[PDB]
Amino acid sequence: KLPVPWPTLVTTLVQCFSRYPDHMKRHDFFKSAMPEGYVQERTISFKDDGKYKTRAVVKFEGDTLVNRIELKGTDFKEDGNILGHKLEYNFNSHNVYITADKQKNGIKANFTVRHNVEDGSVQLADHYQQNTPIGDGPVLLPDNHYLSTQTVLSKDPNEKRDHMVLLEFVTAAGIGSASQGEELFTGVVPILVELDGDVNGHKFSVRGEGEGDATIGKLTLKFIS
Prior knowledge:
It is classed as fluorescent protein. By secondary structure, the protein is mainly β.
């Protein structure tokens, strides 16, 4: 059993699978960084509770898009919504606001996730994000825009392990290929996710597998603890 609720890990567990409409293709940093990939770092501040600090490497390994993350959680409350497992098993729609970070040749993002709590309250998870390309090749630095998300969470009835089935759609909004990296996403791409976590000393790991179809902004993944 994970020591934190599955919904709190959704944003940490591949924005290169977002659908960028044709008029916005010049603003897709995530795909432009491929195949060498990017480092994605966040601080996630759970209001009135602790924080996650995450560092991920997102890159291709052969045909597979891999997201490997180290997560460190500190300052959580014993009977808070996170360590107390008081969050509903669902996920709200969010708008991820992206800005260019010209000095880091990358991007920043900010957004606040709303986690529904079982008593009808809301737990906020304030996200600060920075992404830096790994390669030396040119990348696309975007104008200000956002990603609009939709996520559904479910279970595999045949799976005895603690797990999460996730389906997600993401479209960019708020504004031939525009990068060579974009062309690595034209069809269905297998995904592997590996997370190593420690939250207030509770150690855990998650492995996810599935596929992404960036033409429709879709992710299909199953994660196991």
